[PDB]
């Protein structure tokens, strides 16, 4: 009977979708808000998305347990690995128009506990300096020996690479009309 | 069903899969034997036939 035509107008833009494994949608049938991002963190070649969130203050905080153990306060960060798949187009509608764009990666955000990881790296460093108890020339590739590669090599290149400090903004109309003017 | 596909179906149709296709997939997994002494010497296998 009726028809609603659609066209795809998307190139050059690798827009991503995050998934909050903590936050539900609705609180008694009413959907809540999405929290305010303080800052972000990205590393290329491993595609991590380290999102920072800040907490509520002294009412539900218990600061004298937080200050006395780790001294890293008011920050909950969470990690999400970006994964690739085909399809999965995102669409907004116009009045009797609907325009689409391909999504390039999808990340699933799990709570990356930063400080308790950082609490023990000092504990091992002080243990060395209590009782410290005490030279590189080339070698030859041999055809009867193996070298580390595969999945743990990806962790060897995901530890030291260039961060980019994102300026988190809220735009959403510049990209909107950019699709409208393109057929 | 038994005229073109006989009574010894499992015994012959595996060995016929071995001699034609399954041998090329083995020389391609153990090719290029090398000697660390005199490193410019290499023996590599291009195909295999029976």
């Amino acid at each position: 009977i009726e028809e609603f035509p659609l066209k795809i107008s998307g190139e050059e833009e690798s827009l991503h979708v995050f998934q909050y494994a903590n936050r539900p949608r609705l609180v008694g049938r009413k959907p809540a808000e999405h929290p305010f991002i303080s800052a972000a963190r990205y590393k290329p070649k491993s595609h991590l998305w380290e999102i920072d969130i800040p907490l509520d203050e002294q009412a539900f905080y218990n600061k004298d347990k937080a200050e006395s153990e780790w001294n890293g306060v008011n920050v909950q960060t969470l990690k999400g690995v970006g994964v690739e798949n085909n399809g999965q187009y995102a669409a907004f509608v116009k009045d009797m128009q609907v325009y689409l764009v391909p999504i390039e990666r999808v990340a699933q955000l799990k709570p990356f506990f930063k400080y308790i990881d950082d609490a023990n790296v000092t504990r091992k460093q002080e243990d060395a300096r209590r009782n410290p108890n005490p030279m590189s020339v080339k070698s030859v590739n041999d055809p009867s020996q193996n070298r580390l590669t595969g999945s743990l090599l990806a962790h060897k290149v995901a530890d030291e690479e260039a961060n980019i400090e994102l300026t988190w903004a809220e735009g959403t109309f510049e990209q909107f009309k950019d699709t409208i003017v393109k057929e | 069903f038994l005229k073109v596909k006989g009574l010894v179906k499992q015994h012959l149709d595996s060995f016929n899969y071995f001699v034609d296709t399954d041998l090329k997939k083995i020389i391609k997994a153990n090719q290029l034997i090398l000697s660390d002494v005199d490193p410019e010497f290499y023996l590599k296998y291009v195909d295999i036939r029976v």
């Binding site: 609603f4 659609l6 998934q19 995102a90 509608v93 609907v98 903004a169 | -």
Partner: protein, 104 residues
């Protein structure tokens, strides 16, 4: 028997999504994600006899099957990046998710 309980829910799944594409006409920076089949051997969302949904994204290739099916207690947000620079923009959150299935 239990084959009939499938079609009536997919019948009711047409109406629950036809309402949702009608309330969303006010373009209030709303989004939904859905997956198109690649590997082609554009179109138009249509309404068939008594509310049946199909797309024809090929010149002839018809895709009857569409269905709003996933239940998820997560807040998903579409956001763009560009060239590892000052390009972090939160656009909006996602209300629903449907699929597109080629009929055989």
């Amino acid at each position: 028997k239990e084959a009939a309980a499938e079609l009536e829910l997919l019948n009711a799944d047409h109406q629950h999504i036809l309402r949702k594409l009608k309330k969303m006409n006010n373009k209030p920076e709303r989004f939904m994600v859905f997956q198109l089949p690649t590997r082609l051997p554009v179109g138009s969302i249509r309404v068939h006899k008594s509310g049946k949904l199909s797309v024809k994204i090929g010149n002839v290739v018809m895709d009857i099957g569409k269905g709003a099916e996933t239940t998820f207690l997560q807040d998903v947000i579409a956001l763009s990046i560009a060239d590892d620079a000052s390009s972090a923009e939160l656009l909006g959150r996602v209300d629903g998710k449907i699929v597109v299935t080629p009929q055989i």
